[PDB]
Tab-separated table of C-alpha atoms and ligand atoms in Angstrom:
chain	number	residue	atom	x	y	z
X	1	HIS	CA	37.121	154.528	73.769
X	2	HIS	CA	40.802	154.700	74.818
X	3	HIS	CA	42.916	154.473	77.988
X	4	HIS	CA	45.702	156.968	78.559
X	5	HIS	CA	48.264	156.029	81.236
X	6	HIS	CA	48.648	158.673	83.879
X	7	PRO	CA	52.104	160.193	83.313
X	8	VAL	CA	54.760	158.551	85.508
X	9	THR	CA	56.481	161.931	86.118
X	10	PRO	CA	55.610	165.516	85.164
X	11	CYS	CA	57.036	167.407	82.162
X	12	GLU	CA	59.999	169.664	82.856
X	13	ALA	CA	59.145	173.372	83.029
X	14	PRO	CA	61.430	175.877	81.193
X	15	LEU	CA	64.436	177.085	83.183
X	16	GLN	CA	64.509	180.683	81.904
X	17	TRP	CA	61.978	182.977	80.529
X	18	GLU	CA	60.592	186.499	80.387
X	19	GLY	CA	56.851	186.824	80.982
X	20	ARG	CA	54.058	188.538	82.912
X	21	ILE	CA	51.928	187.535	85.849
X	22	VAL	CA	49.010	188.443	88.021
X	23	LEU	CA	49.415	187.529	91.689
X	24	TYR	CA	46.069	187.427	93.514
X	25	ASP	CA	46.548	187.554	97.274
X	26	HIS	CA	43.447	186.622	99.272
X	27	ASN	CA	44.752	187.806	102.633
X	28	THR	CA	44.608	191.373	101.161
X	29	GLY	CA	42.344	190.733	98.054
X	30	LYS	CA	44.988	192.516	95.995
X	31	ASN	CA	45.833	191.737	92.360
X	32	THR	CA	49.419	192.663	91.558
X	33	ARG	CA	50.391	192.832	87.879
X	34	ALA	CA	54.078	192.416	87.118
X	35	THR	CA	56.617	191.749	84.408
X	36	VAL	CA	58.849	188.906	85.452
X	37	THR	CA	62.353	187.745	84.426
X	38	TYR	CA	62.815	184.197	85.688
X	39	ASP	CA	66.076	182.280	85.930
X	40	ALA	CA	66.098	178.877	87.696
X	41	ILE	CA	69.699	178.187	86.643
X	42	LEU	CA	71.119	181.043	88.750
X	43	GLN	CA	68.085	180.907	91.071
X	44	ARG	CA	67.188	184.554	90.508
X	45	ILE	CA	63.933	186.287	89.703
X	46	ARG	CA	63.231	189.924	88.827
X	47	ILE	CA	59.688	191.271	89.352
X	48	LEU	CA	58.605	194.721	88.038
X	49	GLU	CA	55.197	195.814	89.311
X	50	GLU	CA	52.963	197.485	86.789
X	51	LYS	CA	50.913	200.649	87.327
X	52	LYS	CA	47.483	200.946	85.659
X	53	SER	CA	45.396	204.141	85.274
X	54	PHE	CA	43.820	205.511	88.422
X	55	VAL	CA	44.647	202.740	90.831
X	56	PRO	CA	44.609	204.061	94.405
X	57	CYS	CA	48.205	202.964	95.019
X	58	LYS	CA	51.083	205.367	94.790
X	59	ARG	CA	54.032	203.059	95.386
X	60	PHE	CA	55.324	200.482	92.855
X	61	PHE	CA	58.362	198.305	93.292
X	62	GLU	CA	60.954	196.426	91.427
X	63	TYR	CA	62.267	193.266	93.096
X	64	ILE	CA	65.581	191.539	92.284
X	65	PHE	CA	65.877	188.225	94.190
X	66	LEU	CA	69.341	186.697	93.968
X	67	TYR	CA	69.075	183.449	95.902
X	68	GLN	CA	72.640	182.381	95.178
X	69	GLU	CA	73.738	185.427	97.144
X	70	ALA	CA	71.055	185.300	99.815
X	71	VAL	CA	70.052	188.913	98.979
X	72	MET	CA	66.960	190.681	97.649
X	73	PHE	CA	66.894	194.272	96.416
X	74	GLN	CA	63.613	196.165	96.446
X	75	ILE	CA	63.403	199.467	94.595
X	76	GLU	CA	60.689	202.084	94.635
X	77	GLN	CA	60.288	202.713	90.941
X	78	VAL	CA	59.694	206.483	91.273
X	79	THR	CA	62.009	207.530	94.139
X	80	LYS	CA	64.650	204.904	93.301
X	81	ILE	CA	65.033	204.278	97.011
X	82	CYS	CA	66.553	200.865	97.453
X	83	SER	CA	66.203	198.284	100.192
X	84	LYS	CA	68.760	195.468	100.417
X	85	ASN	CA	67.571	192.469	102.493
X	86	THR	CA	68.800	189.002	103.505
X	87	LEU	CA	67.010	186.004	102.000
X	88	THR	CA	66.599	183.169	104.465
X	89	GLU	CA	64.151	181.083	102.328
X	90	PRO	CA	65.334	178.541	99.759
X	91	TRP	CA	64.712	179.093	96.038
X	92	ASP	CA	61.385	177.842	94.804
X	93	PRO	CA	61.031	177.245	91.103
X	94	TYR	CA	57.948	177.689	88.938
X	95	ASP	CA	57.792	174.010	88.136
X	96	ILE	CA	56.013	170.772	88.953
X	97	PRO	CA	57.771	168.873	91.761
X	98	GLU	CA	58.713	165.497	90.409
X	99	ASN	CA	56.641	163.713	93.176
X	100	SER	CA	53.429	165.695	92.416
X	101	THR	CA	50.013	164.028	92.128
X	102	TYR	CA	48.598	164.025	88.625
X	103	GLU	CA	45.045	165.407	88.591
X	104	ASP	CA	43.845	165.984	85.020
X	105	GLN	CA	44.421	166.935	81.384
X	106	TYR	CA	42.032	169.146	79.460
X	107	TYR	CA	41.693	171.880	76.808
X	108	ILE	CA	41.369	175.556	77.653
X	109	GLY	CA	39.500	177.640	75.114
X	110	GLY	CA	37.168	177.076	72.178
X	111	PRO	CA	37.016	175.190	68.894
X	112	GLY	CA	39.878	176.349	66.608
X	113	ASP	CA	41.762	177.992	69.464
X	114	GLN	CA	42.249	175.764	72.424
X	115	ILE	CA	45.394	174.614	74.182
X	116	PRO	CA	45.897	171.335	76.072
X	117	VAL	CA	47.131	171.644	79.642
X	118	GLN	CA	47.756	169.401	82.623
X	119	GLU	CA	46.958	169.899	86.256
X	120	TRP	CA	49.113	168.537	89.092
X	121	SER	CA	48.965	168.962	92.857
X	122	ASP	CA	50.485	168.017	96.227
X	123	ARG	CA	47.326	166.029	97.112
X	124	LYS	CA	47.784	162.967	99.280
X	125	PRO	CA	45.126	160.908	101.104
X	126	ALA	CA	46.343	161.931	104.594
X	127	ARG	CA	45.384	165.591	104.077
X	128	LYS	CA	41.884	166.922	103.393
X	129	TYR	CA	43.134	169.946	101.470
X	130	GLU	CA	45.951	170.462	98.959
X	131	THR	CA	48.426	173.207	99.567
X	132	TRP	CA	49.561	173.497	95.883
X	133	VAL	CA	47.916	173.116	92.495
X	134	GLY	CA	49.726	173.816	89.226
X	135	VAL	CA	48.455	174.081	85.686
X	136	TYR	CA	51.130	173.669	82.974
X	137	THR	CA	50.899	173.259	79.193
X	138	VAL	CA	51.209	169.786	77.712
X	139	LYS	CA	53.200	170.820	74.676
X	140	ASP	CA	55.996	172.953	76.254
X	141	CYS	CA	55.215	172.624	79.986
X	142	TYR	CA	54.845	176.370	80.380
X	143	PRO	CA	53.214	177.552	83.609
X	144	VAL	CA	49.609	178.718	83.238
X	145	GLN	CA	48.303	178.989	86.804
X	146	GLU	CA	49.288	178.031	90.340
X	147	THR	CA	47.341	178.305	93.582
X	148	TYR	CA	49.330	178.003	96.874
X	149	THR	CA	47.398	177.416	100.160
X	150	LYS	CA	50.871	177.587	101.635
X	151	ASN	CA	51.766	179.437	104.820
X	152	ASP	CA	49.108	178.122	107.200
X	153	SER	CA	46.153	179.813	105.441
X	154	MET	CA	47.905	182.633	103.571
X	155	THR	CA	46.969	181.777	99.967
X	156	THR	CA	47.756	183.128	96.524
X	157	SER	CA	46.821	182.380	92.908
X	158	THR	CA	49.273	183.289	90.225
X	159	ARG	CA	48.449	183.512	86.509
X	160	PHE	CA	51.266	183.400	83.905
X	161	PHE	CA	51.263	184.771	80.352
X	162	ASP	CA	53.187	186.321	77.469
X	163	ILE	CA	56.058	183.994	78.265
X	164	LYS	CA	59.054	183.942	75.944
X	165	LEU	CA	61.942	181.512	76.515
X	166	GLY	CA	65.321	182.921	77.266
X	167	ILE	CA	66.403	186.158	78.814
X	168	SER	CA	66.819	188.899	76.250
X	169	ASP	CA	67.935	191.490	78.797
X	170	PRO	CA	70.252	190.197	81.619
X	171	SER	CA	71.030	193.666	82.876
X	172	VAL	CA	67.721	193.653	84.838
X	173	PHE	CA	69.484	191.482	87.508
X	174	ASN	CA	72.096	194.197	88.117
X	175	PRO	CA	70.864	196.278	91.040
X	176	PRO	CA	70.814	200.109	90.371
X	177	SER	CA	73.438	202.508	91.737
X	178	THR	CA	71.168	203.621	94.623
X	179	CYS	CA	71.434	200.116	95.923
X	180	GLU	CA	74.267	200.915	98.346
X	181	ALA	CA	71.554	200.258	100.628
X	182	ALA	CA	70.255	199.182	103.939
X	183	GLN	CA	67.448	196.938	105.042
X	184	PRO	CA	64.263	199.118	104.860
X	185	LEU	CA	60.693	197.858	105.042
X	186	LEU	CA	59.001	199.289	101.933
X	187	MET	CA	55.304	198.349	101.539
X	188	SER	CA	52.587	199.607	99.182
X	189	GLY	CA	49.610	201.936	99.971
Y	1	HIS	CA	55.071	199.905	67.210
Y	2	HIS	CA	51.242	199.930	67.111
Y	3	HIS	CA	48.306	201.238	69.172
Y	4	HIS	CA	45.329	198.994	69.819
Y	5	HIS	CA	42.155	200.739	71.041
Y	6	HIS	CA	40.851	199.306	74.262
Y	7	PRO	CA	37.629	197.478	73.339
Y	8	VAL	CA	34.549	199.678	73.841
Y	9	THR	CA	32.524	196.700	75.177
Y	10	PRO	CA	33.417	193.085	75.987
Y	11	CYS	CA	32.824	190.097	73.676
Y	12	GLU	CA	29.657	188.109	74.285
Y	13	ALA	CA	30.196	184.816	76.123
Y	14	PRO	CA	28.404	181.661	74.817
Y	15	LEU	CA	24.878	181.139	76.140
Y	16	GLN	CA	24.965	177.329	76.394
Y	17	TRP	CA	27.645	174.839	76.825
Y	18	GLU	CA	28.795	171.628	78.472
Y	19	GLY	CA	32.168	171.787	80.217
Y	20	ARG	CA	34.161	171.127	83.389
Y	21	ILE	CA	35.391	173.316	86.194
Y	22	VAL	CA	37.480	173.499	89.301
Y	23	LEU	CA	36.071	175.735	92.033
Y	24	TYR	CA	38.732	176.739	94.572
Y	25	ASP	CA	37.162	178.049	97.766
Y	26	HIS	CA	39.589	179.869	100.064
Y	27	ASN	CA	37.284	180.002	103.075
Y	28	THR	CA	37.638	176.159	103.212
Y	29	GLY	CA	40.749	175.682	100.915
Y	30	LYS	CA	38.725	173.084	99.029
Y	31	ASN	CA	39.035	172.341	95.302
Y	32	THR	CA	35.793	170.961	93.906
Y	33	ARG	CA	35.938	169.322	90.470
Y	34	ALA	CA	32.670	169.186	88.560
Y	35	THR	CA	31.085	168.596	85.187
Y	36	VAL	CA	28.822	171.481	84.342
Y	37	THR	CA	25.852	171.939	81.966
Y	38	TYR	CA	25.256	175.664	81.559
Y	39	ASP	CA	22.190	177.323	80.069
Y	40	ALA	CA	21.857	181.137	80.289
Y	41	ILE	CA	18.774	181.144	78.043
Y	42	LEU	CA	16.625	179.246	80.572
Y	43	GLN	CA	18.846	180.455	83.440
Y	44	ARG	CA	19.646	176.936	84.624
Y	45	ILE	CA	22.882	175.227	85.549
Y	46	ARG	CA	23.588	171.585	86.398
Y	47	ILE	CA	26.732	170.765	88.420
Y	48	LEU	CA	27.941	167.147	88.926
Y	49	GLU	CA	30.752	166.841	91.463
Y	50	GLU	CA	33.523	164.463	90.563
Y	51	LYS	CA	35.128	161.886	92.860
Y	52	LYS	CA	38.872	161.175	92.526
Y	53	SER	CA	40.782	158.213	94.041
Y	54	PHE	CA	41.276	158.267	97.786
Y	55	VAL	CA	39.947	161.699	98.575
Y	56	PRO	CA	38.853	161.870	102.220
Y	57	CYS	CA	35.308	162.898	101.275
Y	58	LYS	CA	32.484	160.424	101.160
Y	59	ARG	CA	29.636	162.599	99.920
Y	60	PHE	CA	29.305	163.912	96.331
Y	61	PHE	CA	26.410	165.899	94.976
Y	62	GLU	CA	24.601	166.748	91.857
Y	63	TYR	CA	23.049	170.222	91.706
Y	64	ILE	CA	20.232	171.295	89.353
Y	65	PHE	CA	19.590	175.064	89.648
Y	66	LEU	CA	16.444	176.173	87.844
Y	67	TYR	CA	16.327	179.926	88.355
Y	68	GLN	CA	13.204	180.412	86.260
Y	69	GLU	CA	11.393	178.304	88.835
Y	70	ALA	CA	13.175	179.618	91.909
Y	71	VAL	CA	14.158	176.031	92.872
Y	72	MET	CA	17.391	174.078	93.304
Y	73	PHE	CA	17.598	170.301	93.636
Y	74	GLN	CA	20.605	168.769	95.360
Y	75	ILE	CA	21.149	165.028	95.083
Y	76	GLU	CA	23.567	162.801	96.929
Y	77	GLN	CA	24.997	160.816	94.062
Y	78	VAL	CA	25.237	157.512	95.987
Y	79	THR	CA	22.122	157.519	98.215
Y	80	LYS	CA	20.009	159.450	95.690
Y	81	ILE	CA	18.591	161.439	98.577
Y	82	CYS	CA	17.218	164.657	97.195
Y	83	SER	CA	16.903	168.114	98.692
Y	84	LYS	CA	14.570	170.636	97.046
Y	85	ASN	CA	15.276	174.271	98.049
Y	86	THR	CA	14.016	177.778	97.230
Y	87	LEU	CA	16.348	180.062	95.280
Y	88	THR	CA	16.187	183.650	96.457
Y	89	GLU	CA	19.278	184.890	94.502
Y	90	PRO	CA	19.059	186.163	90.925
Y	91	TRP	CA	20.713	184.252	88.070
Y	92	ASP	CA	24.325	185.126	87.485
Y	93	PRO	CA	25.788	184.265	84.124
Y	94	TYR	CA	29.337	183.205	83.310
Y	95	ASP	CA	29.946	186.288	81.231
Y	96	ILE	CA	31.599	189.692	81.214
Y	97	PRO	CA	29.212	192.420	82.416
Y	98	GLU	CA	28.916	194.945	79.651
Y	99	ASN	CA	30.187	197.783	81.987
Y	100	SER	CA	33.355	195.861	83.034
Y	101	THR	CA	36.798	197.491	83.142
Y	102	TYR	CA	39.178	196.223	80.496
Y	103	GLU	CA	42.494	195.154	82.046
Y	104	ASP	CA	44.654	193.313	79.501
Y	105	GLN	CA	45.115	190.996	76.523
Y	106	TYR	CA	47.825	188.362	76.399
Y	107	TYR	CA	48.763	184.840	75.240
Y	108	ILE	CA	48.600	181.805	77.498
Y	109	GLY	CA	51.003	179.018	76.635
Y	110	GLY	CA	54.125	178.542	74.536
Y	111	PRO	CA	55.349	179.015	70.981
Y	112	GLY	CA	53.221	176.889	68.591
Y	113	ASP	CA	50.485	176.370	71.169
Y	114	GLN	CA	49.286	179.536	72.749
Y	115	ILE	CA	45.838	181.083	72.916
Y	116	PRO	CA	45.002	184.802	73.150
Y	117	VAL	CA	42.757	185.824	76.026
Y	118	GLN	CA	41.420	189.004	77.580
Y	119	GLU	CA	41.082	190.001	81.182
Y	120	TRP	CA	38.276	192.221	82.499
Y	121	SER	CA	37.284	193.297	85.997
Y	122	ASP	CA	34.901	195.379	88.130
Y	123	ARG	CA	37.775	197.742	89.062
Y	124	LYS	CA	36.887	201.372	89.637
Y	125	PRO	CA	39.011	204.133	91.215
Y	126	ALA	CA	36.762	204.469	94.303
Y	127	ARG	CA	37.605	200.960	95.550
Y	128	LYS	CA	41.065	199.683	96.496
Y	129	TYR	CA	40.254	196.081	95.620
Y	130	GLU	CA	38.274	194.463	92.797
Y	131	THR	CA	35.568	192.022	93.663
Y	132	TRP	CA	35.551	190.260	90.223
Y	133	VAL	CA	38.139	189.399	87.598
Y	134	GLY	CA	37.331	187.380	84.480
Y	135	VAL	CA	39.569	185.842	81.863
Y	136	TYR	CA	37.839	185.008	78.547
Y	137	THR	CA	39.196	183.936	75.152
Y	138	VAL	CA	39.547	186.539	72.422
Y	139	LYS	CA	38.477	184.291	69.583
Y	140	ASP	CA	35.217	182.770	70.966
Y	141	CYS	CA	34.884	184.565	74.330
Y	142	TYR	CA	34.894	181.294	76.234
Y	143	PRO	CA	35.429	181.556	79.993
Y	144	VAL	CA	38.906	180.558	81.180
Y	145	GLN	CA	39.087	181.769	84.785
Y	146	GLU	CA	37.166	183.959	87.215
Y	147	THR	CA	38.052	185.081	90.726
Y	148	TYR	CA	35.206	186.512	92.902
Y	149	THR	CA	36.119	188.442	96.114
Y	150	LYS	CA	32.362	188.645	96.448
Y	151	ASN	CA	30.459	188.122	99.684
Y	152	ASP	CA	32.374	190.415	102.036
Y	153	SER	CA	35.608	188.357	102.022
Y	154	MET	CA	34.315	184.933	100.966
Y	155	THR	CA	36.319	184.381	97.760
Y	156	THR	CA	36.499	181.758	95.042
Y	157	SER	CA	38.500	181.102	91.868
Y	158	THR	CA	36.894	179.078	89.154
Y	159	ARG	CA	38.759	177.484	86.235
Y	160	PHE	CA	36.845	176.408	83.088
Y	161	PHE	CA	37.808	173.771	80.515
Y	162	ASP	CA	36.727	171.112	78.029
Y	163	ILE	CA	33.896	173.386	76.980
Y	164	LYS	CA	31.723	172.354	74.051
Y	165	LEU	CA	28.949	174.635	72.760
Y	166	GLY	CA	25.419	173.425	72.969
Y	167	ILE	CA	23.735	170.980	75.256
Y	168	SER	CA	23.925	167.440	73.955
Y	169	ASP	CA	21.955	165.975	76.855
Y	170	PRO	CA	18.994	168.116	78.140
Y	171	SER	CA	17.671	165.365	80.353
Y	172	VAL	CA	20.251	166.337	83.035
Y	173	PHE	CA	17.917	169.261	84.009
Y	174	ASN	CA	15.081	166.841	84.825
Y	175	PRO	CA	15.270	166.133	88.547
Y	176	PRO	CA	15.282	162.351	89.460
Y	177	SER	CA	12.231	160.514	90.812
Y	178	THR	CA	13.481	160.746	94.432
Y	179	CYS	CA	13.058	164.457	94.133
Y	180	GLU	CA	9.594	164.488	95.727
Y	181	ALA	CA	11.551	166.141	98.264
Y	182	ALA	CA	11.882	168.492	101.123
Y	183	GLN	CA	14.372	171.154	102.044
Y	184	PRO	CA	17.331	169.272	103.664
Y	185	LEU	CA	20.760	170.718	104.386
Y	186	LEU	CA	23.200	168.301	102.721
Y	187	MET	CA	26.900	169.237	103.099
Y	188	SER	CA	30.108	167.332	102.325
Y	189	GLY	CA	32.575	165.676	104.791
N	1	CA	CA1	57.208	176.075	93.127
N	2	CA	CA1	28.910	186.357	86.564
C-alpha cells in the first residue's frame, strides 16, 4: 500500500479552447446545451445555445461576453435582434482557484476506457456547505464538471465536453452587424 | 461528413459493482461522499458515508437497502446504533430506462485521455423540463453522472467513479448484530 501526497497546488486549466457544455439550472430546472468558445487570455467567452427537436422553447441566443470591454452582446439566433449590455461582474475563469481544497482523485468509466480526474472545492471548516466544486482531468487539467452553490442559493451544474485546445475560429467574437444595439432584456420561453 | 443513427435503445448498464459516489443535494446544498455496493439482481444497495478532515458533521451512516425484503438498515458508524425501517418505494436501478430519449454522444477529457460517453433523458415534448438526465459510458455503459429533478422540485446530482464490476465483499449486505432494531429517525448534523 502506498501514500500519495495531496497536491500542494492544483493543475493549471487550459487558457483557450472550443468545446460544448450543458448548464443545469436548478432555480428553473432547465438544461441549456451550448457550444462554447473560451478565451481566458482576453477574458472573453462566446456561448451559442443549441436547439434540439421539439423542445417547447422558441428563442435561442448567442452570447458574446467581452470582459475587457465591459460589454456583452446577446443575439436572438433567428431574428438576429441584438442586445448590447454593460458587464459589471469581473471575469471568472473555468479553472481551479490556486487556494482550493483538494477533495479526491478517481477514475471515471470502465476497464479499458477510464480517465483519471481530480476533484477540488472551496470547502473550509467554518462553513457547513461548499459553494463550488470542480472536477478536472489529471492528465491535461481539462474541466469535466463544476457545481456552483453561488448566489445565495441560486445553483448550477455545468458539464464540459468535446473540448479542443485553441480557437480555430476567432471571428465568433466579432459581434454581427445588427449589433448597433441597445440594452434589451431578451429571455427564453 | 458522416451520419450516425441515433441508437434505437440504450446500452445495458452493469448489474453489480462496487464504486464511489458524490450525491449533491440542492435542497440542503450538501455533498455526501460514499462508497457504494450495488446489486440490481437482488435489488440491494449498500451505502457507506465517508468522513473527510474537519467537516462540521459528527454523524456518519451506513445504509443497507434490501428491497426484496422491504427493509432498510441505517447504522451510525461510530455508535453502531441501528435503525430498521420499512421500504415502501420500489427499487430503482442505476440504469437508462429502455424508453429514454437519446440526447448526445461526446468525449470527456483531453487529447490522449478522453472517454466517449452518451447522454439520455426522460425529455418529451409535452413537458418543458426533464426530470432525469443520465450520462453513461459508450464502451461499457458505466454510470458517470445523473441529475434527478424528481420529487416535485427536490433535485440531486450524483457522480459515479472508481467502479469495479462484481461484488468482492458480499458480507456488507449482512446487517450488524446491533440491528435487532427498531425504527429510529437518524439524521446528520
Ligand atoms: Ca471559476
Ligand atoms: Ca434510475
